[PDB]
Amino acid sequence: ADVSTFLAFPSPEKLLRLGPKSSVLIAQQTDTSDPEKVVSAFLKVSSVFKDEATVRMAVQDAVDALMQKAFNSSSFNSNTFLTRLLVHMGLLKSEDKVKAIANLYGPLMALNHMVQQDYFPKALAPLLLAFVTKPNSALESCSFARHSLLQTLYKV
Amino acid sequence: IKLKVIGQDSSEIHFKVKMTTHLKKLKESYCQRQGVPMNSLRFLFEGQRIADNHTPKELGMEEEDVIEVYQEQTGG
Amino acid sequence: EFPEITEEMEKEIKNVFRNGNQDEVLSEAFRLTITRKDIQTLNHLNWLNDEIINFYMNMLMERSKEKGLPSVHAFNTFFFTKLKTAGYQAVKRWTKKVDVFSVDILLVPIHLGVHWCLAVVDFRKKNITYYDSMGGINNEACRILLQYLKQESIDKKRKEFDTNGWQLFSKKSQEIPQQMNGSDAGMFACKYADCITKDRPINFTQQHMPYFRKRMVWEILHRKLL
């Protein structure tokens, strides 16, 4: 019933409500053959990221269940996922207008976690590195996460 | 001699610079005081881009007024 | 009719593109500085920075002195944002030492997230025009600027700015040429601004941007617009 209700209006509380099941209930519910839909879930889930043990663990657990499903789909263009992700974070241009999210901390932390996971195609790393650089305004507001993420990509 | 250096995210910092001496070393010891490198910030006095040579004298700087600091801008 | 990038024009460009001292000053005018770093933003499909743009805009402003060409003032790239988020009160001293009404053209480079754009005040045709190589409409940045002119007229001339006949445009995608990549907004901003200040119609497309990028390098080093 919920899970969907979470996605409509993500909150740390709602997410912690779903149980350890939340990871897979989210991942199964999103059409993981479609990069735009996967980006949507990704940001939604990562939007409730908080420095808080239980919430942090939950957010990363969703991301993983989701992304592992994505990267495991033969219909899933990971390149289009990255492009659409950065477009949505307001780090890349696009022909279509987008809601351009306002806070990147969560998103940036989720990425920091994602890139480091076995499931992640290492080939995509250098690509992502080149758009975490370019002196964008919304990034210099999260120096840490940006810097934390850059360090990961070098090493992975 | 008494100036205010204000960033976009509203963070004042007072300097004790000399009437005649170049603003280069102020700029230098601001970026070395707030973390970032030189070519990431630009220093404006009421609009005017402050270069290394600029004397507090060669613009009508008073013993209070504000130097603004701005981001590097990038767009494609 | 587009002059060629000659062999020695090529050598000069390829040199400043090489890596070296990124703080090395390559060009200086207008009490501005163009470092190897700034010049590199013109390389491949690199996003152009503020230094390139303000520099170029200042060059358009210096060229506007020669007879037959409309006088140009150009605000720096930080002007509009500061006008937009803070009030007029925070940009008013920027135009001390400039009678903004004693010129035909005002150029306002705009910085929007990952976008470069341009607004243009033309006191001859009496309009505020917005140009976005991505087809985006800022119907509204013109209103901001129109309000600026009224606020500036009171502040600097002590009289109210006349408004009759003035119009506000945002150019539609099918009437100025668009980007076909995610990287040339600055070039378009600059080159629209180049055409407009020369009173010549915008007749270039994407196909011309690699050439413009390289040519701008020489132009900036030589502080001479072709």
Side-chain angles (χ1 to χ4, degrees), chain A:
Chain A
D2 27 59
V3 183
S4 63
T5 312
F6 175 75
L7 295 183
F9 282 95
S11 89
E13 296 78 351
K14 290 164 190 191
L15 184 73
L16 279 186
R17 262 138 194 79
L18 294 181
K21 304 161 203 166
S22 59
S23 306
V24 299
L25 284 179
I26 288 166
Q28 290 178 327
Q29 222 183 255
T30 95
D31 175 13
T32 191
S33 64
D34 180 12
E36 185 80 349
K37 284 175 194 169
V38 178
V39 168
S40 177
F42 178 85
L43 295 171
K44 282 176 182 307
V45 158
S46 57
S47 63
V48 320
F49 186 103
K50 252 172 54 64
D51 297 338
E52 213 258 59
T54 56
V55 184
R56 180 179 172 183
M57 168 165 291
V59 171
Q60 293 178 349
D61 277 11
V63 172
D64 292 350
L66 173 58
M67 295 315 294
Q68 189 149 19
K69 186 164 177 275
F71 292 124
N72 211 107
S73 163
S74 58
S75 338
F76 181 73
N77 202 308
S78 41
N79 284 69
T80 307
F81 170 83
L82 281 190
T83 307
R84 294 309 296 182
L85 179 61
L86 295 167
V87 170
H88 273 285
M89 293 180 57
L91 301 175
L92 213 59
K93 291 196 175 72
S94 69
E95 289 274 71
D96 64 310
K97 227 203 99 298
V98 303
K99 255 63 205 161
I101 75 192
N103 173 49
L104 306 181
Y105 181 56
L108 283 181
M109 296 299 276
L111 262 176
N112 182 50
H113 177 75
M114 198 212 290
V115 172
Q116 252 172 117
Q117 301 309 310
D118 283 3
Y119 60 76
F120 195 83
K122 305 184 168 189
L124 300 186
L127 218 77
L128 176 63
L129 187 49
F131 292 117
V132 178
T133 316
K134 267 292 183 193
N136 158 284
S137 189
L139 282 191
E140 254 140 286
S141 307
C142 302
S143 308
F144 150 53
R146 191 209 221 160
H147 166 77
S148 202
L149 174 65
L150 291 162
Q151 285 318 294
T152 299
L153 298 151
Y154 292 139
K155 275 180 258 99
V156 124

Side-chain angles (χ1 to χ4, degrees), chain A residues 89-93 104 108 128-143 146 150, chain B residues 8 36-42 70-76, chain C residues 22 37-38 40-41 45-51 77-78 111-116:
Chain A
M89 293 180 57
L91 301 175
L92 213 59
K93 291 196 175 72
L104 306 181
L108 283 181
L128 176 63
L129 187 49
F131 292 117
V132 178
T133 316
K134 267 292 183 193
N136 158 284
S137 189
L139 282 191
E140 254 140 286
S141 307
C142 302
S143 308
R146 191 209 221 160
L150 291 162
Chain B
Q8 295 271 256
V36 282
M38 210 80 178
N39 53 53
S40 57
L41 301 177
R42 333 300 194 211
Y70 295 89
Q71 70 171 155
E72 162 169 17
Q73 272 169 341
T74 265
Chain C
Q22 305 295 295
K37 178 203 178 206
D38 311 332
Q40 191 69 212
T41 71
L45 296 158
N46 293 0
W47 291 15
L48 323 205
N49 76 5
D50 46 326
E51 292 267 67
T77 53
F78 316 108
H111 185 269
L112 270 163
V114 297
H115 301 100
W116 281 114

